[PDB]
């Protein structure tokens, strides 16, 4: 029974390190993507503000055209 | 509870039986609308099998069960088994007697006339219901999301329904029905799975296909550009350890099946895509009533939860649709329970009195009372 | 009651002094200045006097109905909220204000900015504070306890001062909610000491799963502005209702007598009759309370007492009495009714207050005691107002508010995440689960208001 | 020695369960964020075209106004 206990201890201790290792890598991958996600989110919003202006200017030009 | 008396909310479909207590905002005890016997003859003595195995008890152990579904989108293969589904609903989970509280069921748009009278027979004559109504699927969700002017396309596993309801229901047809959802995607997988040394043969494990489906499978934005990407084994294959023990590296399998949604030509049906049928319903209404429909589109149902479902619509619609005003689709991040949130609405309305059927009303107008007052 | 009652006990003539010294005390809590009347209290209080085995008081409890909980953040220009608040900000020292998290700048806030008035010549601010302290100390609230309570109130102030800005998350014209003034929302989580972000993940976004077990919070829905500001109010307002109830009750814990038990006698006290040249939603609910008070007597001095005629054994013959005015009762109870159709229009989320008006006219304009400018040709009625009869006169109401003013309901998807903390203040806001008032927690407003009014009636048809 | 090994095995499996749980929540967090990042990326690209179109149509309107 001792041999079995030692055997399970080996595979458990090893899998424990792998599980912890994966947890760090997964969190590591989460961080790099989260940062990029925030940068994109911010960039997207700035464009939406410019998008509205670009349209209003385009419409204003059309209304200004109709007058002339 | 020293508040009122006799009240409850319910809703059933081809996935879950959504129901709760009186005056609730969200369901309380949802369970799969399944039911089967024993292909294993259940230790015949370690109980006189019977109870087909419905409810959590059924979903727990699938192996012994030969899950034979009763109501496949519209058609009810058998009503005899329905008897002991509602016997499990009101009495076990809801813990209330149907001979007291009303009931608000859902209606599959354009359901056979003979079915309505049959259902009423099970409630009024047997379960004694002095008040109940069977509202029409989609229209319910409209009042929940807070929309009065939009087009609703509510569908999950049951049947697809294009309901242009933004200022009137029951009028010109402008509605469609398509038996292509849920179980259709659940049965199609095992076919194509054969080419990858996998085969969910019987119906019991077929139900699991749906479980894994709703946790990874996504829709392709453009099949052409993602065909060459297949070489890059990174965005495709993903290790999914089957609970028992059999890894399935789903990759191209994820965006191949959902393609059938927009392309019903992969299963021998001339039925046009959900974005074509949308046109079919819009072209019927007046000309000066489209600009507001495009502004807001109500896409509801658990089918509208997969990655790449709303963005694709805004690509195909704009093509064969007017291109001048802005187009926005309102797809509630949790648009599955949209029907239930709307159910809670009509459940607390008093005007609803001029809709449901009272005990005596049935005996005063025979069995046709349903199609004599309702519509 | 006294004198006729008993004497002897030195602790009897002393308590006969504190209850008379409760007049200045009750003149602070319930009372609040209105635009016209200064001492115009605003609350539905039903105080119960407990007694002993000889016939003298021992203690009592306090009960309140649905609160005009919008009083704290919204009101008509010129009016003011409860005094206890304004008398605190100008009574403490900047050193202590910093501990609370307050800055010497009234316009900087929002709840106080919406009013547009602070310093008043009539009422003295610094002079009242010291008097409030005496009142608290005289009863049984030492500074040590006061500070312990201020933390709870100061916490609410942090979670109050947050009217979030436009969140450019959507695409076209609509939008959701997101924090721009972070330090304000941070203050809300500061007292809670939790991840500022995670806090908004469960609130502004509605998470729901349920089924089989019971719920799993994480996936959620960015709701629209209307439902956003809705939860904003429902949250900041519900906490106060729980506080007041726990405030007055926990005070009695010290005042209440443990030496002996006895019977109970109730006393009623409510707001007054006010009529402006203009009107609004709040006028309807206040007048509704009167409709019950008038009906109360009718049920008692006209009905109950009338039954006493035949109980005393007197040759009685039924004499015509003015009808039980069920035209104003049956019209708001059973299906097809005012409050019945009111809940009907409110639940149609998109339907505004204006549309609700039309839902009344069609259903009625025939049943007595209801008119409008369409049917009744009277220029006095505006195009956005309506007529309603009560006892002996006419009152034209406005439509402003109604929506967010009424519903106010709060679900358990916003409370669960907060009561899961570990702090006598955070979880303290939510006393040991259900203070004898629950049965069923999640119910769309309408009914919730019926409870406060039904619990009132059920305890009237079984007493002398 | 068996008793000592069993004791070490008991705590080992407990740490293993905790490690796997942490990794399961981490890999899920990275997953959901990755999906959101892609959704934002597609929304950024589709708007990038609209922004340009909104700018060109504005310049064209100005040129059209100059002619008249
Ligand atoms: N977030 C989700 N992602 C994918 N599928 C989901 C999601 N939530 C629910 N579903 C699925 O949606 C189906 C239920 O959708 P529903 O619209 O209620 O169907 P029906 O009305 O046909 O009963 C079930 O198959 C369920 O697993
Ligand atoms: Ca259905």
**Breaks (C–N over 2.5 Å) after residues, chain D:** none
CA dihedral in degrees (C152, C154, C156, C157; nearest 10)? 170
Q: How far is residue C282's CA from residue C264's CA, in Å, rounded to a whole number?
A: 33
Is the same domain home to B52 and B162? Answer: no
Nearest CA to CA, how far is D54 from chain A (Å)?
Answer: 5
Q: Which atom of ligand 1 is nearest to the CA of B13?
A: 23
Is the same domain home to B100 and B168? Answer: no
H or E stretch including C158? helix C143-160
Cβ within 8 Å, pair A49-C171: no
Q: How far is residue A46's CA from residue D45's CA, in Å, rounded to a whole number?
A: 14
Exposed, middle or buried by CB within 10 Å (0-12, 13-18, 19+), for B30?
buried
Give the method used.
Answer: cryo-EM
Buried b (16+ CB within 10 A) or exposed e, B319-338: eeeeeeeebbbbbbebbbbb
C→B interface, C-beta within 8 Å: 170-172, 174, 206, 208, 210-212, 219-222, 224, 226-227, 334-337, 340-341, 343-344, 347-351, 411, 439-440, 442-444, 446-447, 450-451, 454-455, 458
Asked if C325 and C371 touch (Cβ cutoff 8 Å), the reply is no
Q: How far is residue C339's CA from residue C330's CA, in Å, rounded to a whole number?
A: 10
Is the same domain home to B163 and B300? Answer: yes
- Resolution in Å, one decimal, please: 7.7
Asked if C239 and C429 touch (Cβ cutoff 8 Å), the reply is yes
Are β-strands B329-330 and B297-300 bridged in parallel, bridged antiparallel, or unpaired?
parallel
The DSSP letter of residue B372 is H
Is the same domain home to B207 and B233? Answer: yes
User: Strand runs (DSSP E) across C217-333, as ranges?
Assistant: 220-222, 264-269
Contacts of B143 in chain C (CB under 8 A): 347-350
Q: How far is residue A46's CA from residue B45's CA, in Å, rounded to a whole number?
A: 71
Quick check: C171 contacting A, CB < 8 Å?
yes
Alpha helix stretches (DSSP H) within chain B: 56-60, 83-88, 113-122, 137-145, 183-193, 203-213, 225-228, 259-262, 276-282, 291-295, 313-316, 338-347, 359-364, 370-373
- Tell the residue number behind the tokens 């009423």, with chain if given: B120
Smallest CA-to-CA distance from B204 within B194, B217, B190, B214 is with B190
Distance (angstroms) between ligand 1 centre and the Cα of B122 equals 28
Give the torsion sign (CA, B60, B61, B63, B65): negative
Asked if B339 and B141 touch (Cβ cutoff 8 Å), the reply is yes
Smallest CA-to-CA distance from C372 within C355, C362, C385, C359 is with C385
Asked if A13 and D12 touch (Cβ cutoff 8 Å), the reply is yes
B→C interface, C-beta within 8 Å: 1-4, 16, 21-31, 56, 143-148, 295, 326, 328, 332-334, 337, 344-345, 348-354
Length of chain C: 464
Q: How far is residue C189's CA from residue C197's CA, in Å, rounded to a whole number?
A: 9
Q: How far is residue D67's CA from residue B139's CA, in Å, rounded to a whole number?
A: 53
Question: In which order are the strands placed within the sheet that holds B151-154?
Answer: B151-154, B297-300, B329-330
Is the same domain home to B163 and B207? Answer: no
The token pair that represents C361 in the structure block: 């006219």
Q: How far is residue C442's CA from residue C215's CA, in Å, rounded to a whole number?
A: 14
Smallest CA-to-CA distance from B123 within B357, B364, B311 is with B357
Best residue of C167, C168, C179, C198 to probe chain A, by most A CBs closer than 10 Å = C168
Length of chain D: 68
Nearest CA to CA, how far is C171 from chain B (Å)?
Answer: 8
Is the same domain home to B54 and B39? Answer: yes
Confirm or reject: Cβ of B18 under 6 Å from ligand 1: no
Quick check: helix, strand or coil at residue B154?
Answer: strand
Q: Which atom of ligand 1 is nearest to the CA of B106?
A: 21
Find the CATH number of the domain harbouring B210. Answer: 3.90.640.10
Asked if B177 and B326 touch (Cβ cutoff 8 Å), the reply is no
If one counts every other C-beta atom within 10 angstroms of the C-beta of residue B312, the result is 17
The DSSP letter of residue B163 is B
Is the same domain home to B126 and B142? Answer: no
Distance (angstroms) between ligand 1 centre and the Cα of C437 equals 36
User: Strand runs (DSSP E) across B32-130, as ranges?
Assistant: 71-72, 75-76, 103-107
Q: How far is residue C302's CA from residue C324's CA, in Å, rounded to a whole number?
A: 9
Cβ within 8 Å, pair C171-A48: yes
Are β-strands B151-154 and B160-161 bridged in parallel, bridged antiparallel, or unpaired?
unpaired
Asked if B73 and B111 touch (Cβ cutoff 8 Å), the reply is no
CA of residue C128 relative to chain centroid, distance: 25
Nearest CA to CA, how far is D42 from chain A (Å)?
Answer: 11
- Tell the residue number behind the tokens 């009422």, with chain if given: C123
* Ligand lying nearest the CA atom of residue B18: 1
List, in sequence order, every residue forming a beta bridge with B136; answer none if it has no partner: B107
Is the same domain home to B255 and B218? Answer: yes
Read out DSSP for B223-280? TTHHHHGGGSTTSS-B----SSS----BSTTTTTSTHHHH-GGGGT--PPPTTHHHHH
Asked if C56 and C7 touch (Cβ cutoff 8 Å), the reply is no
Is the same domain home to B206 and B301? Answer: no
Find the CATH number of the domain harbouring B144. Answer: 3.30.420.40
Supply the range of the domain harboring residue B231: 182-267
Asked if B4 and B98 touch (Cβ cutoff 8 Å), the reply is no
Among B214, B254, B300, B306, name the best residue to mutate to test ligand 1's pocket (greatest count of ligand atoms within 8 A of Cβ).
Answer: B214
CB neighbour list of residue C3: distance below 8 Å, 6 or more residues apart: none
Buried b (16+ CB within 10 A) or exposed e, D42-60: ebeeebeeeeeebbebbee
Distance (angstroms) between ligand 2 centre and the Cα of B82 equals 15
Confirm or reject: Cβ of B36 under 6 Å from ligand 1: no
List, in sequence order, every residue forming a beta bridge with B163; answer none if it has no partner: B152
Confirm or reject: Cβ of B305 under 6 Å from ligand 1: yes
H or E stretch including A26? helix A2-67
CB neighbour list of residue C441: distance below 8 Å, 6 or more residues apart: C412
H or E stretch including A42? helix A2-67
Confirm or reject: Cβ of B27 under 6 Å from ligand 1: no
Is the same domain home to B53 and B130? Answer: no
Distance (angstroms) between ligand 2 centre and the Cα of B107 equals 7
Is the same domain home to B30 and B114? Answer: yes
Domain-terminating residue out of B251, B267, B283: B267
Smallest CA-to-CA distance from B295 within B325, B332, B317 is with B325
Smallest CA-to-CA distance from B160 within B143, B178, B174 is with B178
Are β-strands C176-178 and C165-167 bridged in parallel, bridged antiparallel, or unpaired?
antiparallel
Smallest CA-to-CA distance from B143 within B281, B328, B347 is with B347
Q: How far is residue C456's CA from residue C463's CA, in Å, rounded to a whole number?
A: 12
Nearest CA to CA, how far is A29 from chain D (Å)?
Answer: 7
Q: Which atom of ligand 1 is nearest to the CA of B301?
A: 17
Distance (angstroms) between ligand 2 centre and the Cα of B267 equals 22
Domain-terminating residue out of B68, B93, B119: B68
Length of chain B: 375
CA of residue C50 relative to chain centroid, distance: 25
Smallest CA-to-CA distance from B303 within B219, B236, B208, B193 is with B219
The token pair that represents B122 in the structure block: 């099970």
* Ligand lying nearest the CA atom of residue B17: 1
Cβ within 8 Å, pair D6-A6: no
Is the same domain home to B123 and B27? Answer: yes
| Residue B280 falls in which region: left (phi positive, over 0), alpha (psi -120 to 50) or beta | alpha
Quick check: A49 contacting C, CB < 8 Å?
yes
Distance (angstroms) between ligand 1 centre and the Cα of B15 equals 6
Partner-chain residue, chosen from B30, B148, B326, that has the shortest CB–CB distance to C210: B30
Nearest CA to CA, how far is B135 from chain C (Å)?
Answer: 16
CB neighbour list of residue D46: distance below 8 Å, 6 or more residues apart: B311
| Residue A32 falls in which region: left (phi positive, over 0), alpha (psi -120 to 50) or beta | alpha
Q: How many domains does chain B have?
A: 4
Q: How far is residue B27's CA from residue B337's CA, in Å, rounded to a whole number?
A: 9
Query: Helices then strands (H, E): number in chain B?
Result: 14, 12
Alpha helix stretches (DSSP H) within C210-257: 225-255
């Amino acid at each position: 029974e001792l041999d079995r206990a030692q055997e399970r201890l080996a595979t458990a201790l090893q899998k424990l390190e792998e599980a912890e290792k994966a947890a760090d890598e997964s969190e590591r991958g989460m961080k790099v993507i989260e940062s990029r996600a925030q940068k994109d989110e911010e960039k997207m919003e700035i464009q939406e503000i410019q998008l509205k202006e670009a349209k209003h200017i385009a419409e204003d030009a059309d209304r200004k055209y109709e007058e002339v | 509870d020293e508040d009122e008396t006799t009240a409850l909310v319910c809703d059933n479909g081809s996935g879950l039986v959504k129901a709760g207590f009186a005056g609730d905002d969200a369901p309380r005890a949802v369970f799969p609308s399944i039911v089967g016997r024993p292909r294993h003859q259940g230790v015949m003595v370690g109980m006189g099998q019977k109870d087909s195995y419905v409810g959590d008890e059924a979903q727990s152990k699938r192996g012994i069960l030969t899950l034979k579904y009763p109501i496949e989108h519209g058609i009810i293969t058998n009503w005899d088994d329905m008897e002991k589904i509602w016997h499990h609903t009101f009495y076990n989970e809801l813990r209330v007697a149907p001979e007291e509280h009303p009931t608000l069921l859902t209606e599959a748009p354009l359901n056979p006339k003979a079915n309505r009278e049959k259902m009423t027979q099970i409630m009024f004559e047997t379960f004694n219901v002095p008040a109940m109504y069977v509202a029409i699927q989609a229209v319910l969700s409209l009042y929940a999301s807070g929309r009065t002017t939009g087009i609703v396309l509510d569908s999950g596993d049951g049947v697809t329904h294009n309901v242009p309801i933004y200022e009137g229901y029951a009028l010109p047809h402008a509605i469609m029905r398509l038996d292509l959802a849920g179980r259709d995607l659940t049965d199609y997988l095992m076919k194509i799975l054969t080419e990858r040394g996998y085969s969910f043969v019987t119906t019991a494990e077929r139900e699991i296909v749906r479980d894994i489906k709703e946790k990874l499978c996504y829709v392709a934005l453009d099949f052409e550009n993602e065909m060459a990407t297949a070489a890059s084994s990174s965005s495709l294959e993903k290790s999914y350890e089957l609970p028992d023990g059999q890894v399935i590296t789903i990759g191209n399998e994820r965006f191949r099946c959902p393609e059938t949604l927009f392309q019903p030509s992969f299963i021998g049906m001339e039925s046009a895509g959900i974005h074509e049928t949308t046109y079919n319903s819009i072209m019927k209404c007046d000309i000066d009533i489209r600009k507001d429909l495009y502004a807001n589109n109500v896409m509801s149902g658990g089918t509208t939860m997969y990655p790449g479902i709303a963005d694709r619509m805004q690509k195909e619609i704009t093509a064969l649709a007017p291109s001048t005003m802005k187009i926005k689709i309102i797809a509630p991040p949790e648009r599955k329970y949209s029907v239930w949130i709307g159910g809670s609405i009509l459940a607390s309305l008093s005007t609803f009195q001029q809709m449901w059927i009272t005990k005596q009303e049935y005996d005063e107008a025979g069995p046709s009372i349903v199609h004599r007052k309702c519509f | 009651l006294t004198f006729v009652s008993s004497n002897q006990s030195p602790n009897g003539e002393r308590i006969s002094k504190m209850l008379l010294d409760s007049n200045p005390l009750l003149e602070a809590f319930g009372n609040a200045k209105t635009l016209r009347n200064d001492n115009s209290s605003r609350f539905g209080k039903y105080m119960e006097m407990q007694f002993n085995a000889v016939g003298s008081p021992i203690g009592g409890k306090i009960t309140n109905y649905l609160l005009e909980k919008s009083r704290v953040v919204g009101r008509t220009q010129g009016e003011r909220s409860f005094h206890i608040f304004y008398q605190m900000l100008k009574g403490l020292s900047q050193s202590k204000l910093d501990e609370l998290g307050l800055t010497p700048n009234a316009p900087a806030y929002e709840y106080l900015k919406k009013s547009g008035c602070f310093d008043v010549s009539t009422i003295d601010d610094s002079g009242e504070f010291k008097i409030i302290v005496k009142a608290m100390e005289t009863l049984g609230l030492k500074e040590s306890d006061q500070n312990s309570i201020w933390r709870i109130l100061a916490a609410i102030l942090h979670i109050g001062n947050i009217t979030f800005a436009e969140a450019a998350e959507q695409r076209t014209g609509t939008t959701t909610v997101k924090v721009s003034d972070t330090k304000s929302l941070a203050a809300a989580a500061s007292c809670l000491k939790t991840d500022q972000q995670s806090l908004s993940i469960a609130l502004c976004y509605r998470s729901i799963s349920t089924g089989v077990g019971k719920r799993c919070e994480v996936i959620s829905v960015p709701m629209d502005c209307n439902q956003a500001a809705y939860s904003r109010d429902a949250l900041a307002k519900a906490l106060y209702e729980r506080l007041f109830n726990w405030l007055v009750s926990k005070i009695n814990t010290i005042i209440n007598c443990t030496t002996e038990k006895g019977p109970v006698i109730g006393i009623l006290d409510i707001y007054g009759f006010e009529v402006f040249q203009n009107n609004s939603f709040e006028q309807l609910n206040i007048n509704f309370c009167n409709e019950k008070l008038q009906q109360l007597f009718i049920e008692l001095t006209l009905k109950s007492e009338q039954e006493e005629y035949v109980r005393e054994g007197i040759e009685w013959k039924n004499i015509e009495y003015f009808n039980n005015k069920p035209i104003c009762e049956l019209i708001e109870k059973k299906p097809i009714g005012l409050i019945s159709l009111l809940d009907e229009a409110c639940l149609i989320a998109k339907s505004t207050d204006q549309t609700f008006l039309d839902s009344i006219c069609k259903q009625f304009e025939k049943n007595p005691h209801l008119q409008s400018y369409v049917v009744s040709k009277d220029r006095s009625i505006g195009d956005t107002c309506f007529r309603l009869k009560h006892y002996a006169g006419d009152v034209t109401y406005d439509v402003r508010g109604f929506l967010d003013k009424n519903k106010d309901t709060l679900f358990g998807d916003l409370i669960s995440s907060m009561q899961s903390s570990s702090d006598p203040l955070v979880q303290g806001l939510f006393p040991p689960t259900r203070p004898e008032d629950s049965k069923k927690r999640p119910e769309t407003a309408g009914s919730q208001f019926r409870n406060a009014m039904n619990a009132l009636i059920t305890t009237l048809l079984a007493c002398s």
